[PDB]
Amino acid sequence: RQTFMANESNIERKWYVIDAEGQTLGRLSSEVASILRGKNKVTYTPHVDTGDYVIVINASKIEFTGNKETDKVYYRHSNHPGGIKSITAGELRRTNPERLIENSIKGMLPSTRLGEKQGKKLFVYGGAEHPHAAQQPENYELR
Amino acid sequence: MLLPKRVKYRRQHRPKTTGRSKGGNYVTFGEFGLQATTTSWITSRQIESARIAMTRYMKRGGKVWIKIFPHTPYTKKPLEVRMGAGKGAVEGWIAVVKPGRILFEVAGVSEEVAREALRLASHKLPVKTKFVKREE
Amino acid sequence: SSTKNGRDSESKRLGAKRADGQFVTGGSILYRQRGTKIYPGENVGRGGDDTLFAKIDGVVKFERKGRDKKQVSVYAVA
Amino acid sequence: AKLQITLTRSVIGRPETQRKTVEALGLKKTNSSVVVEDNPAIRGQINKVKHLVTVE
C-alpha cells in the first residue's frame, strides 16, 4: 500500500474570479462545480475538502436558450396545506440574479455534510464589484 | 341485415386477424373501389349504415357492390356473471378485413361523384380506407 | 346454467411402430390403424383389427403401391 | 489442427439443445478454446452455435 492521502496540513486553496457575462446557465454551473470539489487537482482526496474559492460577477447577464424564460418555473412548499408557491426563471433573473446561479450550482453538488461545506466557498454578485480584493482573486477562463 | 340463412355450428372460434389479406385485392365489377389499410372487425350493422349513405348521395346513379359478407358469428355472456359454466350465446355476425382488400365498388358515375360517395361511407367503418381505380 | 358436453374416450396409440430400414423379428407389430390405410406387402399379414405384422426376420420397407396408396414389406437380410 | 474455436458468450439462459452442442466441441467455460481440423460435421456444429463462439 503506497497511495497518497491529503490532509489539512498540506492542502492549498486559492481564490478565483469567474465572469458570467454572456454564458449559458447550465454549461457554466457544471464547470464551477468541479472547481469547488477539487476535481482538477492531482492530490484529490474524497474524504477531505480540496477545492478552491470562486467568485461570480455579472450574474444578471446570464443567457437562456429557446422559450425557457417562461416555460421553466421554480416551485417551493411551505409545509402548510396548499402552501405551494411558484416563480418563472425570467422573473427571477430580474429580481434575484444571485439566487438563480446559487441554486443552479448547489444542485450539482453532493448532499452530504462535506458537500454543504464545499458550497459555502461560492460568491455571486449581480455587478462587477466584489468586496474580496484582500483575498487577491485570480481570473479564470472556462474550458 | 346480412346473415347466413343456416350454419352447422353456432359457436365457433375467432379468426386470427393477424397477417395480410388472402384474396379479393382488385376491382373486377365497377370502376372504383374502397381499399382498406388496417385490420378490424366489420359487423352487419356497420355494413348497413355505410351503404345507405353511399346510395343517397349518388341519387340512384349507378350500381353498387358489396364484396364482404359476415360469415362468422360471435357469442357473449350475460351481465354480472362469473367465469365458466359453459359458453355464451350468439350476439352477431362479423367479417375479417386486413390491409389490401376491397369493400365497396361503384359504377355508372363519374370520378368526382364516386370520390365523395365513398368518403361519406368510410366514416361509418372502424377501419382506415383509400380510393383505388381499376389498375391499368 | 349448465353444460351438455364433457365426454371423451381414451386415446388409442395408433401409427407406425418400427422405422424403415430397421431390423425386426417374426412377430413384430409394424402399424396399428383403423381399416386399411397401408396395405401389407411381402411377408406381412393383416390382423383381425387391421394391425400389420411381419412374419420373418428382415428389414422393413415402406413403399408406394399404385397412385395414392402405400404398402409395407419385409425382406430377409443377406 | 486447422480451426480454433473459443467460447465468448456464456451458456446461461440458452436452450438445453444448444448447451449440448457446446459439449461435443470440447468447450468447458467462457473464453476456453480448442483446436480441431475442418470437417464436414465440425462446421455443422459451429453453424448451430455461431452466435456464441468465435471461429478463427
Binding site: - | 381499399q35 389499410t37 390491409p99 389490401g100 389498375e135 | - | -
Partner: protein, 93 residues
C-alpha cells in the same frame, strides 16, 4: 431507342432483392421460345412508359448481353398497397 438492361448473376439474398426494389429497379425473367432462362434487371420507370406506347401486347425488343431479342410481357406482379411492381415475365415468340 431500345431500353437498357442488366444481368443478375448468381443468386441474390432476400436483402439484395429488397434493396434492388428500393433503388427503383425491378427483376425480370425471360423464358420465351428461342432464348434461355436469364435473370435481367430493368428500370421500373423506363418500363412503365415504353409499355405505354406498345401497350399490353406490343413488342419490347429488350437487349440481353449485347444481343437485342424481340419479346413481349406475359405476366407481372403488382403490389396494390404500395403500388410497386415486383416481378415481370418476358415471353419471346
Amino acid at each position: 431507342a431500345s431500353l437498357k438492361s442488366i444481368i443478375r448473376q448468381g443468386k441474390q439474398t432476400r436483402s439484395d432483392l429488397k434493396q434492388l426494389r428500393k433503388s427503383g429497379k425491378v427483376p425480370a425473367v425471360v423464358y420465351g421460345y428461342g432464348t434461355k432462362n436469364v435473370s435481367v434487371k430493368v428500370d421500373e420507370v423506363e418500363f412503365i412508359k415504353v409499355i405505354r406506347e406498345v401497350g399490353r401486347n406490343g413488342v419490347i425488343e429488350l437487349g440481353v448481353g449485347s444481343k437485342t431479342i424481340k419479346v413481349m410481357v406475359a405476366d407481372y406482379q403488382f403490389d396494390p398497397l404500395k403500388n410497386q411492381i415486383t416481378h415481370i415475365d418476358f415471353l419471346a415468340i
